Design an enzyme around this catalytic site. Structure first.
Site, PDB file in Angstrom:
ATOM      1  N   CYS A 146       0.830  -1.205   0.000  1.00 41.91           N
ATOM      2  CA  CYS A 146       0.000   0.000   0.000  1.00 41.91           C
ATOM      3  C   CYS A 146       0.873   1.268   0.000  1.00 41.91           C
ATOM      4  CB  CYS A 146      -0.984  -0.026   1.178  1.00 41.91           C
ATOM      5  SG  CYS A 146      -0.269   0.433   2.799  1.00 41.91           S
ATOM      6  N   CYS A 168      -4.741   3.882   0.977  1.00 42.03           N
ATOM      7  CA  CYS A 168      -4.552   4.290   2.354  1.00 42.03           C
ATOM      8  C   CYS A 168      -5.736   4.259   3.306  1.00 42.03           C
ATOM      9  CB  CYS A 168      -3.946   5.698   2.359  1.00 42.03           C
ATOM     10  SG  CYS A 168      -3.859   6.477   4.005  1.00 42.03           S
ATOM     11  N   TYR A 209     -12.812   3.382   6.381  1.00 44.88           N
ATOM     12  CA  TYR A 209     -13.731   2.240   6.361  1.00 44.88           C
ATOM     13  C   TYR A 209     -15.043   2.514   7.101  1.00 44.88           C
ATOM     14  CZ  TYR A 209     -10.405  -1.055   4.248  1.00 44.88           C
ATOM     15  OH  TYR A 209      -9.549  -1.678   3.362  1.00 44.88           O
ATOM     16  N   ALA A 263     -10.084  -4.415   8.719  1.00 45.59           N
ATOM     17  CA  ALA A 263     -10.792  -4.976   7.571  1.00 45.59           C
ATOM     18  C   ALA A 263      -9.941  -5.991   6.813  1.00 45.59           C
ATOM     19  CB  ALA A 263     -11.225  -3.858   6.629  1.00 45.59           C
TER      20      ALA A 263
HETATM   21  C1  LIG Z   1       0.128   0.631   7.413  1.00 40.92           C
HETATM   22  C2  LIG Z   1       0.469  -0.295   8.101  1.00 40.92           C
HETATM   23  C3  LIG Z   1       0.970  -1.429   9.003  1.00 40.92           C
HETATM   24  N1  LIG Z   1       0.036  -2.638   9.202  1.00 40.92           N
HETATM   25  C4  LIG Z   1       0.116  -3.958   8.421  1.00 40.92           C
HETATM   26  C5  LIG Z   1      -0.458  -3.877   7.039  1.00 40.92           C
HETATM   27  C6  LIG Z   1      -1.893  -4.132   6.853  1.00 40.92           C
HETATM   28  C7  LIG Z   1      -2.422  -4.028   5.580  1.00 40.92           C
HETATM   29  C8  LIG Z   1      -1.604  -3.671   4.491  1.00 40.92           C
HETATM   30  N2  LIG Z   1      -2.122  -3.570   3.224  1.00 40.92           N
HETATM   31  C9  LIG Z   1      -1.350  -3.245   2.271  1.00 40.92           C
HETATM   32  N3  LIG Z   1      -1.893  -3.129   0.952  1.00 40.92           N
HETATM   33  N4  LIG Z   1       0.000  -2.993   2.440  1.00 40.92           N
HETATM   34  C10 LIG Z   1       0.564  -3.089   3.675  1.00 40.92           C
HETATM   35  O1  LIG Z   1       1.790  -2.869   3.775  1.00 40.92           O
HETATM   36  C11 LIG Z   1      -0.229  -3.437   4.721  1.00 40.92           C
HETATM   37  C12 LIG Z   1       0.345  -3.530   5.985  1.00 40.92           C
HETATM   38  C13 LIG Z   1      -0.840  -2.476  10.329  1.00 40.92           C
HETATM   39  C14 LIG Z   1      -1.786  -3.440  10.659  1.00 40.92           C
HETATM   40  C15 LIG Z   1      -2.701  -3.318  11.735  1.00 40.92           C
HETATM   41  C16 LIG Z   1      -2.577  -2.160  12.466  1.00 40.92           C
HETATM   42  C17 LIG Z   1      -3.563  -2.122  13.569  1.00 40.92           C
HETATM   43  O2  LIG Z   1      -4.393  -3.031  13.745  1.00 40.92           O
HETATM   44  N5  LIG Z   1      -3.418  -1.041  14.396  1.00 40.92           N
HETATM   45  C18 LIG Z   1      -4.278  -0.948  15.585  1.00 40.92           C
HETATM   46  C19 LIG Z   1      -3.836  -2.017  16.708  1.00 40.92           C
HETATM   47  C20 LIG Z   1      -2.282  -2.074  16.706  1.00 40.92           C
HETATM   48  C21 LIG Z   1      -1.875  -3.140  17.799  1.00 40.92           C
HETATM   49  O3  LIG Z   1      -1.843  -4.406  17.669  1.00 40.92           O
HETATM   50  O4  LIG Z   1      -1.532  -2.651  18.941  1.00 40.92           O
HETATM   51  C22 LIG Z   1      -4.178   0.460  16.183  1.00 40.92           C
HETATM   52  O5  LIG Z   1      -4.859   0.714  17.205  1.00 40.92           O
HETATM   53  O6  LIG Z   1      -3.438   1.279  15.635  1.00 40.92           O
HETATM   54  C23 LIG Z   1      -1.636  -1.137  12.230  1.00 40.92           C
HETATM   55  C24 LIG Z   1      -0.742  -1.294  11.143  1.00 40.92           C
END
Ligand SMILES: C#CCN(Cc1ccc2[nH]c(N)nc(=O)c2c1)c1ccc(C(=O)N[C@@H](CCC(=O)O)C(=O)O)cc1
Ligand SMILES: C#CCN(Cc1ccc2[nH]c(N)nc(=O)c2c1)c1ccc(C(=O)N[C@@H](CCC(=O)O)C(=O)O)cc1
Lengths: 264, 264
Positions: A146, A168, A209, A263
């Site tokens: 992404c 994003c 979302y 999601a």
């Molecule tokens: C961007 C990015 C990184 N990523 C991984 C991720 C997910 C989908 C993607 N999708 C795509 N197309 N590319 C990516 O690099 C990608 C990376 C993340 C995933 C989850 C959270 C999340 O759930 N944040 C919550 C809980 C965090 C926790 O466990 O403490 C929050 O409250 O912020 C944050 C970043």
């Protein structure tokens, strides 16, 4: 941050309703740009508590050229769990492309190393770029990057970086990515004896979302707080030798964290 | 055009002096974005006469996957001469990466047709991207692609496109690139039965060469005139069957041309 909160409000006000691959639904706008002067402080959002731990290990994980979430588990970061295969592999994503982009003739290109050498020997270059958008390997990735294209720029001893993020997730992903790249910029600047400049963020399909409306409204009614300050305790012999302990954030007093479903 | 003129005045006001691989010197800023609503008119700069002939033929040339200047010569377009080798070859640049990006496993991806298929069957996808930045073949190219990453977006039956131009010659190259992509958007939209939306231009190292300053100020003293209109007289079977004569530009009444040297 003021810029971040402003973007959220824009999505809510101008967003178009779109049906996505997950079936959840999204509010979306196309094309946006924000600038963060790193001199003013580290761009870690304060209207909600962010976990710097997962942000730092992911970045260090990338720099090692690792695509297996094993290392992330060793450090209790589970952000990549639901896309890894039964063995914990994600395919040739970020880490692989950054450290060893495969050429059609079998060789390998280390973009991080070449970037380091460009900053040191040819700072005026207009092509100091790192791309994770390897067209011929996308089908092998457990997910399409992404944030797949970024550029470094030097002017007056300052080091700037622009990131084009094609897709994003405004609420969950954006805060993560801003902090992540601001981090990389500080690391790079230190290894190349330069000052930190601006972090320019450019978005393509920038969305919010459907199941994040409530959390967004809650976050929008909070007042942003002065940005923290990034401190690097020691200077390692290379950009590949940093550890979680080397970083220290200071003056970070955020509003309470906000839980939101991811999601998938 | 208003947006273009404002960009110029901006690099002049906030730009920093930098040196480049040629030794000419540039005035430059890092990070900018501007939008063009294609329904307001065709974005061809009016503050100086532009050469449609050259812009159209270059694009048709790209779309065929050609990287030799023979075709351009058959049509009196010499914009690429300085970089071609003895045989008229430029190496695997735009045309080749667009229509036949080579993968490690011996396959070739046609990005243009894949994007056309995404616009028809998966318009909500956030991966409708075309890249010319093939890290593995950069060393075989006569030049490093300056406009190497673009994205398509669909909303309310309208096609939008954002181009990330990492290196931009504001005086000479920008007017060409803006018109080129605006034209690709009309062709894409006509093939997918969509209306044209916005063209978003984002720049990295956005500069003005030192020997373009007088020409820049000369142009800045002029009042942009009304935007011309693009008329397409035919709907070819494919995106690859357009001809120069299918296009008609109406109401193009520009200011006189302004000559300036190319920094090789
Ligand atoms: C961007 C990015 C990184 N990523 C991984 C991720 C997910 C989908 C993607 N999708 C795509 N197309 N590319 C990516 O690099 C990608 C990376 C993340 C995933 C989850 C959270 C999340 O759930 N944040 C919550 C809980 C965090 C926790 O466990 O403490 C929050 O409250 O912020 C944050 C970043
Ligand atoms: C961008 C782009 C395409 N190009 C080719 C071109 C040139 C340098 C590049 N440099 C880089 N890094 N990437 C490129 O893709 C690239 C492409 C152009 C080259 C010259 C003119 C030019 O000289 N324009 C003058 C004279 C036109 C004429 O009469 O022949 C003018 O008055 O407009 C315009 C476009």
């Amino acid at each position: 941050m003021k810029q971040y909160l402003e973007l959220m409000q824009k999505v809510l006000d101008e967003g178009t309703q779109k049906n996505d691959r997950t079936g959840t639904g999204t509010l979306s706008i196309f094309g946006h740009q924000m600038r963060f002067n790193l001199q003013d402080g580290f761009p870690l959002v304060t209207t909600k508590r962010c976990h710097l731990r997962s942000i730092i290990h992911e970045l260090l994980w990338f720099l090692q050229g690792d695509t297996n979430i094993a290392y992330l588990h060793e450090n209790n970061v589970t952000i990549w769990d639901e896309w890894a295969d039964e063995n914990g592999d994600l395919g040739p994503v970020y880490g692989k492309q950054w450290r060893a982009w495969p050429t059609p003739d079998g060789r390998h290109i280390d973009q991080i190393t070449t970037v380091l050498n460009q900053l040191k020997n040819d700072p005026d270059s207009r092509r100091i770029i790192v791309s994770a958008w390897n067209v011929g390997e996308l089908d092998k990735m457990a997910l399409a990057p992404c944030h797949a294209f970024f550029q470094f720029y030097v002017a007056d001893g300052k080091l700037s970086c622009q990131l084009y993020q094609q897709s994003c997730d405004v609420f969950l992903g954006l805060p993560f990515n801003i902090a992540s790249y601001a981090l990389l910029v500080h690391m790079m600047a230190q290894q190349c004896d330069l000052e930190v400049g601006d972090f320019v963020w450019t978005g393509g399909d920038t969305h919010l979302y459907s199941n994040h409306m409530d959390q967004t409204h809650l976050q929008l009614s909070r007042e942003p707080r002065p940005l923290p300050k990034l401190i690097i305790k020691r200077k390692p012999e290379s950009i590949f030798d940093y550890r979680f302990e080397d970083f220290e954030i200071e003056g970070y007093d955020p509003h309470p964290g906000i839980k939101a479903p991811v999601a998938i």
